[PDB]
């Protein structure tokens with residue numbers, strides 16, 4: 116077999132289910148006997164078939180349907196290979212979900228992929244659109260030379276018992292087959308020729324996190340665009356993990372973004388880039404003893420230009436699902452204070468409180484102790500800062516080993532090895548900034564109002580809202596949800612963020628994931644759209660600045676799942692078709708987080724008063740990709756130009772098969788012209 120290119124083809128159109136034979140190519144005899152090599156191809160799929168082989172080599176005869184090698188893509192954006200010679204001899208597979216796309220801005224686009232079969236290193240690697248997607252290691256390295264009875268080289272399908280299986284439909288822009296193993300560098304470069312949308316945060320940036328989730332995007336009145344997201348270190352798992360909140364800004368309308376920062380973070384566990392296992396066992400494992408922050412909300416007070424970042428604060432080993440019932444506060448002398456448990460007391464003996472100036476008091480004696488905390492909640496014993504060893508986490512087989520290192524970090528009340536431990540429920544935290552993220556204020560735990568009967572009271576991720584007109588103009592609002600006397604709730608401030616008041620919006624005690632976002636009506640009244648535990652998105656209205664809310668009404672015509680998915684709904688500054696408009700983003704499928712769509716809702720005055728005053732007509736819907744393509748959490752923002760920016764999870768974040776994927780948080784922009792189908 117010669118060194119270099121064995122076969123090359125260009126601009127090949129393939130009719131769905133027909134495939135294309137490469138048997139007559141001069142190098143077919145070499146390709147049918149490859150001991151290793153590299154395949155790189157550019158393609159555009161126009162088919163909705165489930166599995167679509169791009170290139171294959173194998174045995175087409177009867178009874179030999181399990182003898183072949185093929186590189187394929189799926190209608191849901193997955194990509195992979197299967198190297199087979201019947202299950203008794205070998206069946207090597209490698210894939211990565213949500214690796215490619217089908218449609219971008221209304222048109223089918225080309226993706227560039229590559230498979231490298233490295234005999235010397237006994238390794239197989241898959242690449243797509245400039246990224247290394249997956250790696251397979253095998254002691255018994257195998258390739259085309261190991262398949263019995265190869266009799267064909269085919270494009271757009273895999274020949275099985277004389278039939279075209281895994282039928283592709285579309286165009287193979289280019290294909291090059293090398294007998295040699297090209298370097299990862301050459302393949303990253305070669306496949307990187309086609310990319311769509313951009314990353315703000317990414318595996319390898321200064322956050323040191325390989326994964327991200329829960330997007331927040333907001334254009335400030337100054338023109339600067341800011342964003343935040345969970346920096347999920349231990350895979351894409353929710354809290355009871357190691358998660359920090361990442362932040363970045365753009366001063367050029369969303370074209371380029373600054374180096375990300377970590378405004379909300381904990382140091383009990385080290386922040387590092389780690390590849391979380393995706394196998395059936397390891398994928399379910401998560402960090403057990405780390406404190407974390409989760410689900411960000413960004414908000415701007417246009418009157419003061421101040422910005423706020425909110426997120427849930429989870430004590431060590433705590434998440435929404437295992438949070439203890441209680442406020443985490445104790446009332447002494449009429450004032451609520453954070454309570455603490457001395458590590459040597461009984462398991463549930465929270466006999467201390469953090470009072471004025473961070474001084475820790477003994478409640479039984481009502482006398483101050485020798486301990487105190489700073490504005491970051493780190494402990495001190497007589498002005499001397501307390502410390503503890505930072506933990507590291509590594510997999511030993513399917514087991515996650517969490518061990519102490521020799522690195523000292525300040526002892527914080529939310530850490531598992533702290534001498535004074537906070538109550539194991541969730542808290543609401545926030546910091547403000549007057550210089551667009553250059554510096555942030557001290558940690559402000561605003562959840563003193565958490566109902567003592569609640570398991571958890573958390574934020575609805577995305578952005579908050581400031582009322583611009585009416586009696587309550589200037590009021591700041593942040594959506595919340597809980598498992599307590601109410602499900603949907605809100606916290607508002609009339610003094611520019613200095614103080615917050617909690618509001619129960621219903622009397623539902625089921626604790627469903629009622630993530631909501633708020634939009635303002637022309638007269639200042641508000642409409643909140645929310646995820647529910649039923650097969651619909653609900654709408655509630657307030658005519659008193661968010662103090663009381665109407666009963667839930669299903670949002671007619673916008674399909675969703677029973678478990679649901681977070682949504683984003685924003686006010687647009689200019690009228691569309693002459694009417695005030697709001698824009699909504701959410702996956703449209705009734706099962707699975709996929710088929711993302713952006714809708715434009717036109718506000719109509721019905722002629723009625725009160726809660727029935729306005730009616731929103733969802734006149735336009737825009738499909739971001741094809742129906743099976745992944746789309747989960749998202750956040751919209753009107754950019755300084757007329758465009759609508761979109762930061763979203765381009766995969767199914769609920770699925771147990773799409774956990775721990777790198778670089779799925781994408782940033783895209785769309786004009787109103789595009790969104791209204793007006794080209």
Ligand SMILES: CC(=O)N[C@H]1[C@H]2O[C@@](C(=O)O)(C[C@@H]1O)O[C@@H]2[C@H](O)CO
Nearest residue numbers: 329353354409410427435573628768
């Ligand atoms: C505080 C918290 O746990 N937020 C979670 C919840 O929502 C998500 C989700 O993708 O649906 C992602 C959020 O980061 O998974 C969680 C689950 O639904 C339990 O509510």
